């Protein structure tokens, strides 16, 4: 019997079957009302007011979240939840009561036979073929740095960053306005998101790149809009992702990702830091910028002691590493013994989820 | 506690035990092929040593071939964590990459580490 794997993202839901190499269903985590779910709601942005049930990785609107899960099972996968185990993902440091609430909905509303809740960052490390390392996960809503040693995350060293892809899209939109283009609406927000993914990159040295880009026109690139018009983008290509390293660009007091990663490793016992510096694993869609590995290696090497060897790992398929890791875990011969059964829930209630 | 018939045999006496990841399961390697590794596969290795007092010491290695698929290397890592837990966390875990193995791991095989082309098909 094949389990279903569902990764609950702030931007997108990734859903599919255990044993596949990639999710078969990816759609936006949106619910619109004049109820439409996913892409249905994004095409109809006029009559509908859109709501995001997941905020910075945490479920905040349970009614709408149940509508998203219904859409996942029936409209997207065409699967009877009563006949498949379900593996669900959660963000690091997810509130305890929300893990229980998610468990109650699965057994009482969808009547699943068994389920399991896994931490997103740990799934990503397993997908890279590792048991020890530090995962930098940055998606649409939130970024985290999660040290993991011999299979288990270290909660005292997990650090959170209020800066991710959605903040970067709004920044590119603002500086393209300063450039002379008039992107503003929610629909245009989706086009600027495509520009970001297609033309942006991370400079190895920001200050030098600013002078390089002005001394020639090789920085410029053209982008065709859906209507057919063409625009040109210059130094906004590397200024936008730079906010990951200098959050002040966005009016935030937070430290950049390189400083955050460094502070996370310092919170760990000195005897394991070498294994952490040598296994910095990137995960999530916002780590997909060209040049990110080389910039991250330079900045962390500048902060870390010289006796440590810094190695940043950038898997080509890291945009879905969380889901891939769940697909592998839930396929193992030993997984039958790891999950919560409908029997155990009927006797213990939703609290059984924590000792499992 | 998670188990598996191969878990019941592991670390009961001093010696060397090698398993191969085969479509999301852990399968023992025939004893005479120990030391020959398919470049397309991943393996789990447990070295057990007896101590002066009489207690046992555990070293867990997961070896990854240059051509092994993502499902096999990911499964090898998870099985390694699960076997360590079954041993009450007493084992030390080591990641070994084809061609860059630690001196300790290479030293388990007096005839030397050898590689073969091919392997078992992926679970994906
Ligand atoms: N090639 C790319 N370059 C840069 N950013 C990208 C690229 N591809 C996707 N993104 C951004 O990655 C983000 C989505 O990644 P992800 O799908 O990992 O978010 P999530 O997992 O849905 O959110 P969270 O995990 O924080 O809840 C979006 O903001 C998207 O714009
Ligand atoms: Ca193989
Ligand atoms: Ca251990
Ligand atoms: K994230
Ligand atoms: Mg995510």
Numbering used by the authors:
A (entry chain A): 6 to 39, 53 to 374
B (entry chain H): 2 to 125
Question: What does the published report state?
Answer:
Outliers of this functional consensus are actins of the phylum Apicomplexa, including Plasmodium spp. and Toxoplasma gondii—both notorious human pathogens. With less than 80% sequence identity to their canonical counterparts, actins of these parasites are among the most evolutionarily diverged eukaryotic actins while still retaining most of the core features. Here, we analyze phosphate release rates and high-resolution structures of wild-type and mutant Plasmodium actins in different nucleotide states, bridging the gap between structure and function in understanding the polymerization mechanism and the instability of the parasite microfilaments.
Moreover, H74Q did not form any long filaments, even though its elongation rate appeared rather similar to the wild type. In this mutant (MgK conditions), the Asp180 side chain is oriented away from Gln74, which interacts with Arg178. However, the backbone of the loop did not adopt conformation 2a, and we therefore call this conformation 2b, because the carboxylic acid group of the Asp180 side chain occupies the same space as that in conformation 2a, preserving the interaction with Lys270. The conformation of the A loop clearly connects to the stability of long filaments in PfActI. Conformation 2b is counterproductive to Pi release, whereas elimination of 2a by steric hindrance (as in the mutants A272W and A272C) or by charge neutralization (K270M) favors Pi release, suggesting that interactions of the A loop with the H loop and the P loop are required for native activity levels.
